[PDB]
């Protein structure tokens, strides 16, 4: 079979690499399927943004509320000394926000407060890990905002995910079995169009490749531990087949430039399989 032959490439590959590394891939209409250190939880950083705005999405669909329904943010909610597009925009606050622009922020640009204000929209935390819950969906734990991540070093932790779980939703999801057309039209255009990384999934693929994702990252303690780089998302094949895929290079003592490079080599490495 040429699924082991890949499997044993990619474990190769990460012999020598001082991380812990999640893989899994997901045919999108056929069934192809891959793992790779599969039973481990992954620190999901950012890309639990994309969890989330499945759930606001539902929520819109559900209570028939508007993508272009305004919400007033307090000042108080633009948190200092983190990445947020929005406060750097409205630095002052007390602005009335579309739900549309607010999470085009936070799923595009990855805002950290774009996502605090939506989790705050939702419920919070528990909501988003029931909603993904009852979808059948297991083995993914949300517990902490951004502002709750941003203290203590261990909290990022307490969202995790294995890599199989995050293929089955990102499958889900884009054969469309969540969302309403139009939420799930908008919500697969902003993961299309964002610019965050391109030497991740991206990186090694050809030219005009389209790639809808989400990424994640973390700091790095003062043991040289990066905690976290991450990139989900679904792939167009030439034939215009699809793939869903999810990268976790965890606790890595490697320079940021190989835990990009991790992601996009193993990713070229499923892409020239499927292609042959």
Known sequence: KGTDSLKSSIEKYLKD????????????????????????????????????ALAVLDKLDKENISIDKKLFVKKSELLPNTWSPLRDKYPDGNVDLSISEILKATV?????????????????????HNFISKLGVKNISIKA???????AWNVQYTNWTTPDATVQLLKKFYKNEILSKNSYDYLLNTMIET????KRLKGLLPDGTVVAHKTGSSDTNDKGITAATNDIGI???????????AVYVSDSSEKSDVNEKIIAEICKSVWDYLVK
């Open 195 to 198: 610019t965050t990384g391109p």
């Open 145 to 151: 905002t951004e502002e709750e991540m941003h203290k």
């Open 17 to 52: 690499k001082k991380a812990k590394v999640g893989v899994a891939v997901l045919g999108i209409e056929d069934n192809f399927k891959l793992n790779v250190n599969e039973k481990h939880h992954y620190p999901m950083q950012g890309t639990y943004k994309f969890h989330l």
């Open 108 to 128: 595009s640009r990855s805002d950290n407060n774009g996502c605090d204000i939506l989790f705050r929209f939702v419920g919070g935390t528990n909501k988003v």
């Open 235 to 245: 792939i167009t094949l030439p034939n215009g087949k699809h793939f869903a895929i």
